[model samples]
Target: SLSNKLTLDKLDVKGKRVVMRVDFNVPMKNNQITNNQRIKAAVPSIKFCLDNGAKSVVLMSHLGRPDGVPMPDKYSLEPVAVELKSLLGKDVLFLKDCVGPEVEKACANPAAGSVILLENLRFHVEEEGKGKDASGNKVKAEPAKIEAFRASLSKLGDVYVNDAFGTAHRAHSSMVGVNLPQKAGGFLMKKELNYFAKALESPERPFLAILGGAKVADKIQLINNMLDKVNEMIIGGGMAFTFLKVLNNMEIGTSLFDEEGAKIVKDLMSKAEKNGVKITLPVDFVTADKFDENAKTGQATVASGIPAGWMGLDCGPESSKKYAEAVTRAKQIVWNGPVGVFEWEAFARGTKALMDEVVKATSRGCITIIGGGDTATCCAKWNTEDKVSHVSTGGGASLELLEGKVLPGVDALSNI
Candidate 1:
């Protein structure tokens, strides 16, 4: 199976310079890595290699899209390098290139116990699979162009480790193709799959899954895949508006709804009912006249009675009580997306309340996992990150896994 693939403990790094790949693609504002959760997630494997007799560990990761040309501080791993130096408590040898003669030389003479971070891989034309033009926008590539880009990084590492679970869905050379005969998964990758399996593959009932977030386009397959496995499912967030608009007949106003996903939502609900799954949609919402603090706040007119100019921002107190009660009863729970627009202080109550319920459930031995972007951040912000069993690194990657798609990076590491 893909999960049975070797992890860091399975490999011997004695006296070798281990070149590690991690998911440090953090959000940057004003040229600084805002969050270090991805970097922190890789701590165990990075430290494991060093403690287990590895001479040096060279870290590599890609930041935002740079169109394969060095942009002045636009797509830089420098801030991440600085953070790594502090976290590792050692000077990180920051290489300005991913794979070239200069990088080869730097890796060759790295001091023992030193950690190194390569420049953003996407900075090179070869790394991005696009030869640059004068305009600086990425151009479409032919097969030969893609292959040449893949070959550039093939020689960089004697051993490749896939820890970047966030990019596992992409077939990037570093993420998947770079793993030669000698490769293994890092701790984070192992944990991602382990929690995934526990929730979706083999879990004791009564399993409950809470699905939310905006954009129904991304989560259709996930809803379909998990519907049968879950005993109960709670729908919330902006996506919930779409289902309520059709299923329970909501007069949605300025609130977001996915018209394109109407049929799929009906089909999924039907499928869940046929499979004996109990699906729950919020009966009450915290509605606002506008999406700002000045907007009027009141309990919504049920799920269907939402009026024009009013947007549902979060679950009302009644819904929160019901959702929390459901969470309390579940033996296995998987949650993705926030129950509302949690980033906004005015709309955080529903998601925060849900998180508190998750904590309560976790304390009772419930195997609860959180997936998706805002959901993971909410757990962290609420100081309930440690309460759950797992928080997925990749939002899209996590949803795809829940949707029953096999990730190529995971496929490459499968034990034969």
Candidate 2:
């Protein structure tokens, strides 16, 4: 299996310089980190390397989309170093550049158990598979520059460890460019790969997939890949309107939907039926007169159609109960998106109720997984994040894995 890769624990890092790729792409406002959850998630592996007699730990990460242009104060890793210092309760040395003379000096003869945070990798154009043009725009990096950058960066440490599950789907240079025999998956990366294998390759009987969110366009490949493995599927969110339009020829009013998504749902319907997969769409909806949170809302008695001049905002009470019942019977469950506009209280009922049901299923010993992103945020808001089997740290990565695509970051690791 693709998940059968070497992990940090199996690799010997004692007295060796460990180059670690971490997901420090956290939210920031006015030069301050808004969320340090991703940073905290990587703590175990970082601490492990230190406690295991590693000579030094060099951490590399990209923050924000600077688009390969050097934006020093704008997207610096200095703040991240501050946060890491507090989290690790130690002095985290901050390097101004990822690869250069000064960086080489720091890694050449470092104190044992030292942790060094490199400047934003995105500061260099080659980091994003691009090079700077004379006009300063991103263009393909020259072969020599690419090779030179990779070689210089790879020489910074004796080993490579990828703890950045959040970027597993992305094939960035920092993720796959490093050359080392001692490369391995970090703690969070291993957890993501292991859980995905359990859910996809050898799931318990009656595997159920619950997918939602704003549009079907984003989930078509995921749905197509899962149809063969899932015994049952539940569809919700604005994407459900597209499925309803295709299946029942229902006029969904001014509800948000993608035409291309409607076509994909049409094609998948027959395949799902042929595979004996019971695909469930919301049986009813809560419609709103306007898109505003305080707009007038009412529940539909039927699921197939909505009146003109109104938009569907949330699933009706009956639909929430039906989705809950599906969770009750599932042996394994994977939920990707919110069933409604959960940020607004009026439209949050369906997603909130479904979350409650998923939590209940977890208590019943059902293997439940939340596919990160906004769904992970919602679960955290509900205080039920720890109650589930696993909450993936990578949103796009998790979806790509479910779509049966090999992650470049994970694939770059040495095989066991």
Candidate 3:
């Protein structure tokens, strides 16, 4: 149904300034962009707008938290602008503010194919609250008011495009308010939505879901939601310990736990049994005397085998092999999060083993979908990103979508 909205193939943007919301939340180090994946994903839409004679495309996005204050140094988008120029070979005007007269004039006067980056939208509380016209130089609406938020941003453009899958759940002005009478999902958004729709609504038999990460609390609702959707699920990461601890009534040492998650896992396990969902938890873990990488780490079979001074870093080698084998038979595989402490090389094997399985499955015609944050990083780190069917850009956003939650940005479109 979302595809019914305007697409690049159907829309005409000749000489029009297209205000596009893209996810430029790439990782940065030393004020240098470390990952250009998100920015580069917008190339097709931007290039299409340019080649078709669009006046100029204005991009709005938020990076690492500006704490809802005007922290200029932290809010600067020069890194993104530089990268965009290098990729597009076009001049991109970087504006200091998102709303008001000056930025509006800049957008109005852009040459064909020119690009512009607005300052971090989160720098002002209005962006999260009021949703102002970021391309403008001054704010017309006061913060803490919804109408003012919508009104402030309404002047940016005649067309709206949402490519920021990472922020889709938030009904901020840039994401939802900007999509006018004419709106479309950018390439990444379309692909993300379509891939999810296909896997959820219509998929081949033997659907497998592998969910991991640090917080059991974050995934309880998700697991509860997908109990019947997936045929089998491999739960890993620190969350695995909580489930194992709860199962065995053992003391979990220095492991993450969620009070709500403990309750949900109990009920979900029961529901899974009733629904014929096979849920798998690791039998062993790579334990450690400390949380850090260089801690005294060793293999342990029982969840409570973790010593008082030690924590669990990752799954043991045996568990990694077993998890890999479980995925071999799946026709549709949905993987999110890392199986272990994926950042530290010593603890990365469990995650890498599973990554190898998914990549191999893709080669075997399996519809493999890697959803969310660390999962994407794991895929990239293991050199399997290109082999998977889809690597979702938004981790949390993807999880919500898979649970059938309507994204605010996506929901607002087509209503007009």
lDDT of each: 0.79, 0.87, 0.78
Superposed model 1: Cα runs more than 4 Å off = 29-33, 108-114, 128-134, 141-149, 215-218, 414-416
lDDT of 2 by residue, 293-347 (tens): 8988876644457788889999998899889878888999999889998999999
Candidate 1 to truth, TM: 0.91
Candidate 1 per-residue lDDT, tens place, 321-399, comes to 8898789889999998788878778888988888988988999899888886788888778888788888888888887
Candidate 3, residue 289: Cα displacement in angstroms equals 2.4
* TM-score per candidate, chains pooled: 0.91, 0.96, 0.88
Per-prediction backbone clash count: 0, 0, 13
Q: Give the top-scoring candidate (lDDT).
A: 2
Looking at model 3, residue 1 earns an lDDT score of 45
Q: Give the Å shift of residue 277 in candidate 1.
A: 0.7
lDDT of 3 by residue, 29-68 (tens): 8889888988888888788888888887888888886645
Give the top-scoring candidate (TM-score). 2
Q: Return the lDDT, model 2, position 108.
A: 78
